[PDB]
Amino acid sequence: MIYSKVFLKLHWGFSVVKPLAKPGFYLPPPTTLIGALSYGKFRGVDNINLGNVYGSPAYNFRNIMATARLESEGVYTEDTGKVYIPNGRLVVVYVTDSISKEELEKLCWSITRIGCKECLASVENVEVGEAKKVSGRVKTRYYFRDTVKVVGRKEFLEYVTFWEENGYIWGKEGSPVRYILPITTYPLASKEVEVEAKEAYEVGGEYVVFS
RNA sequence: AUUGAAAGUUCUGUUUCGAAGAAAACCCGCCUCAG
Numbered sequence: 001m002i003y004s005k006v007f008l009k010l011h012w013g014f015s016v017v018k019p020l021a022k023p024g025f026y027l028p029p030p031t032t033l034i035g036a037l038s039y040g041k042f043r044g045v046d047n048i049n050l051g052n053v054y055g056s057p058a059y060n061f062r063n064i065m066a067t068a069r070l071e072s073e074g075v076y077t078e079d080t081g082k083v084y085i086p087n088g089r090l091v092v093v094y095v096t097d098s099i100s101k102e103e104l105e106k107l108c109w110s111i112t113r114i115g116c117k118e119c120l121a122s123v124e125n126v127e128v129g130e131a132k133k134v135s136g137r138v139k140t141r142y143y144f145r146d147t148v149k150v151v152g153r154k155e156f157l158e159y160v161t162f163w164e165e166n167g168y169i170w171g172k173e174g175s176p177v178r179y180i181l182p183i184t185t186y187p188l189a190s191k192e193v194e195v196e197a198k199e200a201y202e203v204g205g206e207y208v209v210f211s
Numbered sequence: 212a213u214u215g216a217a218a219g220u221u222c223u224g225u226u227u228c229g230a231a232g233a234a235a236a237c238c239c240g241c242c243u244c245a246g
Contacts, residue, residue, distance in 0.1 A: 016213085016214070016215085017214065018214080019214050020214095028213085029213090029214090031213060031214085031215095032213045032214095032215085033213085034213075035212070035213025035215075036212090036213065037213095038212080038213080039212050039213075042212065043212070044212080045212075046212060046216075056212085056213080056215085057212065058212075058213065058215095112212090113212090113213085114213080115213070115215080116213090116215070116216095117215095117216095163214080167214075168213090173214090174214090
């Protein structure tokens with residue numbers, strides 16, 4: 001199980017609107033993170049024949065684990081929800097085993113935007129390594145699933161709804177999955193939460209929780 | 212190539228006209244550079 005870390009510098013922020021008034025999300029979903037990685041290999045093409053229907057040139061990277069977190073302060077504003085965090089820093093962790101270290105590192109440098117066109121984001125540095133699996137009590141900053149238990153004080157937790165990769169195809173809505181975000185609503189920031197969990201990969205001290 | 216893809220809330224307008232800080236008032240009364 002290989003892992004990679006990337007540091008991104010945002011220009012003005014990101015904007016992803018909720019499916020189904022156009023409120024937006026607080027942090028990008030894993031689908032956007034996987035699509036940004038896939039942009040490095042599928043550049044120039046917008047429709048691929050999956051075999052039955054044209055849905056996206058991203059239905060092949062669906063099994064790559066990804067998380068992300070903030071490192072600065074921002075504000076969420078509706079004026080079409082937007083998350084303004086100019087000159088901020090984003091840390092993205094990719095955990096997978098499908099490809100070797102070289103391919104993941106090459107695709108990691110090829111991230112251009114997160115969300116829509118205006119949300120450009122440069123790349124400052126990357127790290128690649130081998131991760132270890134643990135199950136003891138850990139402290140994490142990355143968001144995780146709803147079913148994961150919590151031992152600490154419930155004070156900085158929010159509930160959001162994301163979608164699986166089934167939504168990659170047009171004319172079809174993805175499955176609803178609940179997610180827990182350790183975020184302060186105003187001003188925007190990230191806080192540490194202690195969880196027990198069952199699977200946690202150590203990617204340099206900042207344990208990443210998946211289930 | 213990411214609930215992503217496709218879009219200007221843009222066009223037209225004077226804070227303008229008018230109204231003396233003006234009138235009265237002494238620096239002035241005393242002193243050899245001398246043998």
